[PDB]
Write a protein that binds this ligand. Structure first.
Ligand SMILES: CCOc1nc(NC(=O)Cc2cc(OC)c(Br)cc2OC)cc(N)c1C#N
Lengths: 357, 10
């Protein structure tokens, strides 16, 4: 009726006329995303179509979560909403959902590949860092931070992204978490342990090392080598840790060949660091000591968000209004240990769009 | 000290 068909790649876009001139910027882990102009508002905004949402109990749970989370999280570093709509009219008609949100200038995969300075890099770390702290401040782990999901503005801002997974620690592992990027998968994930708010930091760890090394920290050629690669770098884990890992995994992870591990003083020389020479608190050895406490195998000994923000490298940008920020409160409907039908996610998801406009 | 507000993304 009042929407229009935008021939984009494969599935065609049927967005409001508000959004015109659609170009592709990426394809997240749900549908696809474009950087169109929203005349009505005056500024380029990202429209995300989740073509056929409720295919199954998966792309329908990651959605209801994405929806609610989107409308609940507000923060200077955690991307915000803007508009959500469905080109379909009737209750049955529904089969697609478009999401309009902010739109930076690039994605971290652009900085990673450039020579920052200190004050700066430390700001983004802080930046990105806070957003994280906030999201957690509601018992919400993201579980997927990685350049492909981090966005920085030319004015040097920065925002987290994709709340398609970011759930709460209510359930444990799964021998099918292969969805969360390898190079940024944390030990408790890999080893199918059981995550907590911390996991997110590890991601942030494999990040910095990337903002420093330029190469990705722990490659991996399969989810099973990932481990054989992370530990080849950080040494074989302390026996107590072993006692933690599930029965089976323990055996295998134990059989692995023993690795010395390298001190971060060599894992990140004084050279791979931004001109170590300004404003005390900063200093290369601090950018590192930071890592020194994030890149940690045993989940229970990893510098949590707070202490990170509360850390010599980060800290210099602290400020209660954007860190100890008000907790992004949740209603009382969200279900992390509960599933339904597709004709139910529909009613639920459809009844989760409508009102919105 | 105050944070920066640039970032040459080219
Ligand atoms: C890739 C993840 O998708 C998303 N990406 C963004 N990204 C951005 O705004 C930064 C950005 C700006 C660009 O110049 C116009 C191009 Br070109 C690509 C790009 O980075 C991709 C914002 C989102 N809200 C979502 C979503 N959803």
């Amino acid at each position: 009726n009042n929407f229009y068909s935008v021939e984009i790649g494969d599935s065609t876009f049927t967005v409001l006329k508000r959004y015109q001139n659609l170009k592709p910027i990426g394809s997240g882990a749900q549908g696809i995303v474009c950087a169109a102009y929203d005349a009505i508002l005056e500024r380029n905004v990202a429209i995300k179509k989740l073509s056929r949402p409720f295919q199954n109990q998966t792309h329908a749970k990651r959605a209801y979560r994405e929806l609610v989370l989107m409308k609940c999280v507000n923060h200077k570093n955690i991307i915000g909403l803007l508009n959500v709509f469905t080109p379909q009219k009737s209750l049955e008609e529904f089969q697609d959902v478009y999401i309009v949100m902010e739109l930076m200038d690039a994605n971290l995969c652009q900085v990673i590949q450039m020579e920052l300075d200190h004050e700066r890099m430390s700001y983004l770390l802080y930046q990105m860092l806070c957003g994280i702290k906030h999201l957690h401040s509601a018992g919400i782990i993201h579980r997927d931070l990685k350049p492909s999901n981090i966005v920085v503005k030319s004015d040097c801002t920065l925002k987290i992204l994709d709340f398609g997974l970011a759930r709460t620690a209510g359930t444990s592992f799964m021998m099918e978490p292969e969805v969360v990027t390898r190079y940024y998968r944390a030990p408790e994930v890999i080893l199918g342990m059981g995550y907590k708010e911390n996991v997110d930091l590890w991601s942030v760890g494999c990040i910095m090392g990337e903002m420093v090394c330029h190469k990705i920290l722990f490659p991996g050629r399969d989810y099973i080598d990932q481990w054989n690669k992370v530990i080849e770098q950080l040494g074989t884990p302390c026996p107590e840790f072993m006692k933690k890992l599930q029965p089976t995994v323990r055996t295998y992870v134990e059989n692995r060949p023993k690795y010395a591990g390298y001190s971060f003083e060599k894992l990140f020389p004084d050279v791979l660091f931004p001109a170590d020479s300004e404003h005390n608190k900063l200093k290369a050895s601090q950018a590192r000591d930071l890592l020194s406490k994030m890149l940690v195998i045993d989940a229970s000994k990893r510098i949590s968000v707070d202490e990170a923000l509360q850390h010599p490298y980060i800290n210099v940008w602290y400020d209660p209004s954007e860190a100890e920020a008000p907790p992004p409160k949740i209603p009382d409907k969200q279900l992390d240990e509960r599933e339904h039908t597709i004709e139910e996610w529909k009613e639920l998801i459809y009844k989760e769009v409508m009102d919105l406009e | 000290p105050k944070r920066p507000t640039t970032l040459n993304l080219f």
